[PDB]
Design a protein around this ligand. Structure first.
Ligand code: ATP
Ligand code: 21O
Ligand code: CL
Ligand code: CL
Ligand code: CL
Ligand code: MN
Ligand code: NA
Ligand code: NA
Length: 284
């Protein structure tokens, strides 16, 4: 038996604070809701800018994708609202900012930290892919950290609810070869990005690097990268099983029977998967 279905906020309901970050079309601001004293990260878009650059569909898409997500390792969308000039997304506040910030400052994560944060990302992707959603812009800048230093994956403007997807979106360093050669992405495209990220955690920079996107693309499609010395051996093996040109041969992909075999990789031997979000992360 189904009953009938079960108040939009306004800018004035908040006190706004510092800018937490910026994107091409967005400014993210820390805000406190006056009625509850809860802090939120509010992502704000200028309608005029969204309209001029033909981005209207990706605003609605971001809201609709995030509305589906309720996993510990994803930023949560609590509310949306608009006024005459702006669009507002009320997000959970990830107090410790971008994973990228820590890679930059520290340069390289130790093996325990690499294993732990890789596991959290794997866990997050298993959930996302289980819902038939691909992220398409997975990268350390979009992996935030909450007050307890657990990951909070964000930025679903490029996400796609699915198989294959045809838009050319993402960030060059993390773009999959199939998106370059087949002009389409799939869930396995996020596993390619995962491999790039693991390599970055250990080596300091992602594996295909250049100051020009074209140069990066040429290397991606030829699998032109190599490992530095001292790269943790089990992480190397895992990266080699993710950075595979054939998207149907990547550990974790549907054609390779999904996340069980990926979580079973020897790199994760010591990982207790069931309660990762309740564990204390290793110190960076
Ligand atoms: N929920 C949050 N908590 C804390 N900081 C955040 C949050 N969301 C975004 N930020 C900060 O703002 C930055 C930009 O946010 P986001 O990545 O969602 O913007 P975007 O407009 O989609 O970026 P781009 O246009 O470059 O793709 C983030 O990298 C982060 O530094
Ligand atoms: O999707 C909406 C309104 C939509 C919204 C979506 C994301 C963030 C904030 C609000 C809004 C709605 O009323 O549908 C809401 O959820 O409160 C929208 C998208 C683009 C434009 C414009 F073209 F102006 F840019 C306007 C509204
Ligand atoms: Cl404002
Ligand atoms: Cl504030
Ligand atoms: Cl670049
Ligand atoms: Mn974005
Ligand atoms: Na999971
Ligand atoms: Na982003």
């Amino acid at each position: 038996q189904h009953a009938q279905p079960p108040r939009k906020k306004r800018p004035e309901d908040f006190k706004f604070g510092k800018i937490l970050g910026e994107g091409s079309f967005s400014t993210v601001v820390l805000a406190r809701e006056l009625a509850t004293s809860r802090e939120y990260a509010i992502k704000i878009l200028e309608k005029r800018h969204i309209i001029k650059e033909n981005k209207v569909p990706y605003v609605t898409r971001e809201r609709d994708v995030m509305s589906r997500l309720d996993h510990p390792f994803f930023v949560k969308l609590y509310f949306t609202f608009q006024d005459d000039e702006k669009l507002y997304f009320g997000l959970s506040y990830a107090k410790n900012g971008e994973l990228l910030k820590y890679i930059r400052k520290i340069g390289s994560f130790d093996e325990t930290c690499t294993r732990f944060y890789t596991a959290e990302i794997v866990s997050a992707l298993e959930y996302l892919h289980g819902k038939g959603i691909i992220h398409r812009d997975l990268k350390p800048e979009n992996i935030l950290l909450n007050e307890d230093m657990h990951i909070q994956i964000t930025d679903f403007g490029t996400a796609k609810v699915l198989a294959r997807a045809n838009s050319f979106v993402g960030t060059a360093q993390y773009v999959s070869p199939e998106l370059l050669t087949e002009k389409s992405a799939c869930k396995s495209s996020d596993l390619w990005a995962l491999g790039c990220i693991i390599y970055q955690l250990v080596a300091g920079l992602p594996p295909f690097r250049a100051g020009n996107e074209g140069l990066i693309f040429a290397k991606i499609i030829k699998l032109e990268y190599d490992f530095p010395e001292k790269f943790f051996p089990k992480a190397r093996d895992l990266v080699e099983k993710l950075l595979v040109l054939d998207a149907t041969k990547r550990l974790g992909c549907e054609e390779m029977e999904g996340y069980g075999p990926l979580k079973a990789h020897p790199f994760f031997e010591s990982v207790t998967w069931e309660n990762l979000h309740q564990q204390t992360p290793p110190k960076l």
